[PDB]
Amino acid sequence: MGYDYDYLFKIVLIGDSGVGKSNLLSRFTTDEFNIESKSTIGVEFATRTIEVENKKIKAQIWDTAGLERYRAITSAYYRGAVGALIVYDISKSSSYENCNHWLTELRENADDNVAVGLIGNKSDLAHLRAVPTDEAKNFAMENQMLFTETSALNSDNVDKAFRELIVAIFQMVSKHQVD
Ligand SMILES: Nc1nc2c(ncn2[C@@H]2O[C@H](COP(=O)(O)OP(=O)(O)NP(=O)(O)O)[C@@H](O)[C@H]2O)c(=O)[nH]1
Ligand SMILES: Nc1nc2c(ncn2[C@@H]2O[C@H](COP(=O)(O)OP(=O)(O)NP(=O)(O)O)[C@@H](O)[C@H]2O)c(=O)[nH]1
Ligand SMILES: [Mg+2]
Fold first, then answer.
1. What CATH number should be reported for the domain whose range is 6-179?
2. Of 67, 88, 165, 176, whose CB count within 10 A is highest?
């Protein structure tokens, strides 16, 4: 209360430890980055309110370490989420290859009809690129996922990545005028 919003969307970040989930969260919600961030303790969330078609959408973004955890924690994490972002590190091909493992956790825990986006983070490390863009783009298309390469470090495409997901959920859950 105190805040006028039309929608609240819970969105979860999933992906290997180290890919940059927490920095994506912090960059998107509070415009902060930390080069010395460590593995996440417990579960955290932050919120940013954006505007789409003149409606205010509260985007509540959840974060937890990309590591094995108990069933009760993972169920609470996914519960109520209407969007997910699967994150890999464009400089680390093993993280990208593990995306199918994250897709599996998603299918196993997520509510019906969640919007899914794939993010290749750390695009500022293109001098050490291990994952070709066209390969990742194709993988996203094959699995009906949004796709963006981002850098939490320099802010490149971070708003774009989150906004596109939010706009996609918004599209789904509201009525729209034609012409
Ligand atoms: N809780 C609450 N907040 C309101 C209400 N009306 C306006 N506000 C706050 O006042 C802010 C400024 O109003 P408004 O200009 O309508 O915001 P917008 O965000 O719609 N800006 P433009 O529309 O861009 O100014 C709103 O963004 C909102 O945070 C209200 O009825 N209840
Ligand atoms: N160069 C660069 N480094 C990044 C970028 N994003 C995150 N990092 C760095 O990569 C490291 C890991 O980031 P972090 O956000 O903590 O990853 P995480 O996915 O949250 N890990 P965990 O799951 O364990 O909690 C940190 O040193 C962080 O600063 C980026 O866009 N570019
Ligand atoms: Mg983290």
1. 3.40.50.300
2. 88
Quoted resolution (Å): 2.0
Ligand nearest to the CA of 51: 1
Report the alpha-carbon distance of residue 82 to residue 108 in Å, rounded: 15
Instruction: Give the ligand 2 atom nearest the CA of 34.
Output: 29
Give the integer Cα–Cα distance in Å for 54 and 52.
5
The experimental method, as deposited, was X-ray
| 143's tokens | 């699995």
Going from N- to C-terminal start, the domains of the chain cover 6-179
Q: How far apart, in Å, are the Cα atoms of 69 and each of 38, 42, 74, 76, 77?
A: 17, 10, 7, 12, 11
Q: HSE on the CB side for 121, CA within 13 Å? A: 32
Ligand nearest to the CA of 3: 1
